[PDB]
């Protein structure tokens, strides 16, 4: 579950894990596609679509969907989630305004992005009826058995994490999430490249001058705008997308 | 496993100097530097600085930097307080200890001095 | 420049839970202040329980638990014995030194 840099998360730009990219009001059905920074669907392992796994921390928090919202001008319809990818039924609004609660917290993102729905056909709804012709629109499934795109999804960059650098008493300590990579250094010359166990730091004292990094690339992400380069190298991981738009007749 | 035993307690008159010795076993030495700690009669319990038991360079705290000087023979695991210009109100036990996990894991004995003509 | 404070003294009972702090007069305590807890008994016998916040040192009973709780950290005696009864100093880091609390006289029943 990716997390990246929400523009208006409640107050302002937070890092939201379900930071809000590639809005697509793009079909005719009440519906958008959207994906989250966030990987909901199974939990960490193997079980349960219907779960929610979300970064906390450097961390998962792979646990139940139980409040998920996403809304606009008014309160949307989910329809689908898979992967980081959700498919929802909203209205028309001038933005998006998408949020779960995690049961501590709101803990929203919020976007902006032109929504539109026009039905297919010479009536210009601005929402689909009860009845009335059936006729070719353009809409998303409802599915996962999907392969008729894929996106690349190569490796996450490093990410901060200054719960990491400590003080060891008068120098600052840094330490590892399980034995990943921490690349490391600080403006005064100590350790130079950082690839270790839990560190110190001989030369540095404040922590606001030091280099805390993760390089925890055992799982690759979406490359999202809002994601900094590995800048090792363009790792595999080419993936697909489950919300092809079909030619349902809605 | 890791003992550091301290060296016993000094009489001192007014301007004397003292080194007081760290002695330490069960850990190799050089991956664990020396914190230097006085725990002063009624005051409790205060940092006095670190030794690098490494490359050997010693921190000093502010109330510390001056007639206090570590050191340490290395070659035989002992790490030094040295207390140059002994002032009265130097009586006090100092306690040698192992920075280690984020925090100090063992101390020593103690070697009280008593400053007095 | 910074000044660690503690609970004066505290008394419970063998089998009870009891939990000392230690606050910094300067901010919240934080896991980069790698609160460090260290036990007194009669002697000038130190031994270290806890550090880097929740790291129990080697050979330290389990019923020694140290934390975070609001804005400072915490050490929690969890079936606190009649052995427990010392004083227990905090020290916090402070980005290039370490400042000692006033420790806290821990009396258990027993």
């Known amino acids: 579950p990716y997390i990246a840099d929400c523009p208006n998360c409640g107050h302002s730009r937070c890092d939201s894990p379900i930071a809000i990219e590639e809005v697509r009001g793009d079909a005719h059905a009440g519906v958008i596609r959207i994906q989250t920074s966030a990987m909901f669907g199974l939990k960490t392992d193997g079980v349960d679509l219907a779960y929610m796994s979300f970064m906390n921390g450097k961390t998962q928090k792979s646990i139940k969907i139980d409040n998920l919202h996403v809304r606009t001008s008014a309160p949307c319809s989910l329809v689908s989630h898979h992967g980081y990818y959700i498919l929802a039924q909203c209205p028309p609004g001038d933005t998006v305004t998408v949020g779960f609660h995690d049961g501590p917290n709101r803990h929203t993102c919020t976007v902006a992005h032109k929504v539109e729905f026009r039905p297919v056909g010479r009536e210009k709804y601005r929402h689909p009826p009860e009845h009335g012709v059936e006729l070719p629109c353009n809409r998303y499934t409802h599915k996962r058995a999907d392969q008729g795109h894929y996106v690349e999804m190569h490796q996450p960059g490093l990410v901060a994490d200054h719960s990491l650098l400590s003080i060891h008493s008068a120098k600052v300590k840094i330490t590892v999430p399980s034995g990943a990579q921490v690349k490391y250094y600080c403006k005064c010359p100590d350790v130079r490249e950082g690839i270790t166990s839990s560190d110190h730091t001989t030369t540095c004292t404040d922590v606001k001058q030091c280099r805390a990094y993760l390089i925890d690339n055992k799982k690759w992400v979406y490359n999202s705008g809002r994601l900094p380069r590995g800048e090792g190298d363009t790792f595999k991981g080419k993936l697909h997308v489950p919300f092809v738009p079909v030619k349902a007749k809605c | 496993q890791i003992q550091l035993v301290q060296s016993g307690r000094e009489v001192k008159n007014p301007g004397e100097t003292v080194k007081i010795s760290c002695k330490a076993s069960?850990?190799?030495?050089?991956?664990?530097?020396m914190l230097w700690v006085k725990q002063a009669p009624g005051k409790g319990f205060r940092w006095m600085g670190l030794?690098?038991?490494?490359?050997?360079?010693?921190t000093y705290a502010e109330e510390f930097k001056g007639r206090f000087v570590f050191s340490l023979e290395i070659s035989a695991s002992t790490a030094y307080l040295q207390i140059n210009n002994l002032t009265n109100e130097d009586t006090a036990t100092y306690f040698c200890?192992?920075?280690?996990?984020?925090?100090?894991?063992?101390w020593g004995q103690g070697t009280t001095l008593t400053v007095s003509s | 420049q910074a000044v660690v404070t503690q609970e004066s003294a505290l008394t419970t009972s063998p089998g009870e839970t009891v939990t000392l702090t230690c606050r910094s007069n300067?901010?919240?305590?934080?896991?980069?202040?790698?609160a460090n807890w260290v036990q007194e008994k009669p002697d000038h016998f130190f031994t270290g329980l806890i550090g880097?916040?929740?790291n129990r040192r080697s050979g330290v009973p389990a019923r020694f638990s140290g934390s975070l709780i609001g804005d400072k950290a915490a050490l929690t005696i969890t079936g606190a014995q009649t052995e427990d009864e010392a004083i227990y100093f905090c020290?916090?880091?402070?980005?290039?030194?370490?400042?000692f609390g006033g420790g806290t006289k821990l009396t258990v029943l027993g």
């Open positions: 880097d916040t929740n």
């Open positions: 200890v192992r920075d280690y996990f984020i925090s100090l894991d063992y």
């Open positions: 020290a916090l880091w402070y980005n290039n030194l370490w400042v």
């Open positions: 030794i690098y038991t490494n490359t050997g360079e010693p």
């Open positions: 300067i901010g919240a305590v934080t896991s980069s202040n790698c």
């Open positions: 069960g850990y190799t030495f050089t991956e664990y530097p």
